[PDB]
Design a protein around this ligand. Structure first.
Ligand SMILES: Cc1ccc(O)c(C)c1-c1cc(-c2ccncc2)cc(C(N)=O)c1N
Length: 276
């Protein structure tokens, strides 16, 4: 026998019949496509039987190994719930566990920025400015909730309608103690994180490298001298071919190595170039 699905929430089932053998996920959604699969599990595009609408569902790959493994996986939901509703953040609809598998159902978004870049070379800069602005709005929101994303990168930002984008993957959020967390991508890591230091500035730095990468369509270094030379407070000319003066200047504000001097998200959003 199998336990009924249980909702996962850190706050406080229609068309679904517990008498039937099939899972809540099998009963309650029509699977339309698989959007991704990895170590973590799989992400499907689905339509909900409850309301007829499209959603994305991520399910973990194998049953929990013990109580701490379970607790660590469930913590993604608690972090995501802390983000709540914001037009530039992937919205969680509900989460549940069944069969030792964790499910997160979110709004359905478009391709990640990584995927978008791979299937476009170099993006029109007008598009890039919109992605920068929307993800800065996301970070202003996170910081207001006392949260820092330690893995801002092209794979974790998803396109929406009319040039919009949404930040996701909130299992790598930490609170301002911090909470257990995994490794962020070294390509986009703020330099102060080498010393375990973090704060609201760190994801501004990662967003700077994220936007640099998608604007120049070149691979950023994961270590070595090239990694150091992106953390000195200038842009190596290797990366700036075809970047406008305006975009270059804003990225250099974001890439200041001293996090005490680095621009805040709100200061960046207040620049004339990022109006509206
Ligand atoms: C389901 C979910 C739960 C929590 C979360 O933080 C996020 C980002 C997701 C989410 C993940 C993906 C995805 C696509 C390929 N590879 C990895 C991930 C796509 C979407 C999407 N296109 O809607 C999506 N909402």
């Amino acid at each position: 026998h199998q336990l009924q699905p249980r909702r996962v929430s850190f706050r406080g089932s229609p068309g679904y019949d517990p008498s039937r053998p099939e899972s809540f996920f099998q009963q309650s959604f029509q699977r339309l496509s698989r959007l991704g699969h990895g170590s973590y599990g799989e992400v499907f595009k689905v339509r909900s039987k409850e309301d007829g609408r499209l959603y994305a569902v991520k399910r973990s790959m194998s049953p929990f190994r013990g109580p701490k493994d379970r607790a660590r996986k469930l913590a993604e939901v608690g972090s995501h719930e802390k983000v709540g509703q914001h037009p530039c953040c992937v919205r969680l609809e509900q989460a549940w566990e069944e069969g030792g598998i964790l499910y997160l159902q979110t709004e359905l978004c478009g391709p990640s920025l990584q995927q978008h870049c791979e299937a476009w070379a170099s993006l029109p800069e007008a598009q890039v400015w919109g992605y920068l602005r929307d993800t800065l709005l996301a970070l202003a929101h996170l910081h207001s909730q006392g949260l820092v994303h330690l893995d801002v990168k092209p794979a974790n930002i998803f396109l929406g309608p009319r040039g919009r984008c949404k930040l996701g993957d909130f299992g790598l959020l930490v609170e301002l103690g911090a909470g257990e967390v995994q490794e962020g991508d070294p390509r986009y890591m703020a330099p102060e994180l080498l010393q375990g230091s973090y704060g609201t500035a760190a994801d501004v730095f990662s967003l700077g490298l994220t936007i640099l990468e998608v604007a120049c369509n070149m691979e950023l270094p994961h270590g070595g001298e090239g990694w150091q030379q992106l953390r000195q407070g200038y842009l190596p000319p290797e990366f700036t071919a075809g970047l406008s003066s305006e975009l270059r200047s804003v990225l250099v504000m974001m890439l200041e190595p001293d996090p005490k001097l680095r621009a805040t998200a709100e200061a960046l959003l207040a620049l004339p170039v990022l109006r509206q």
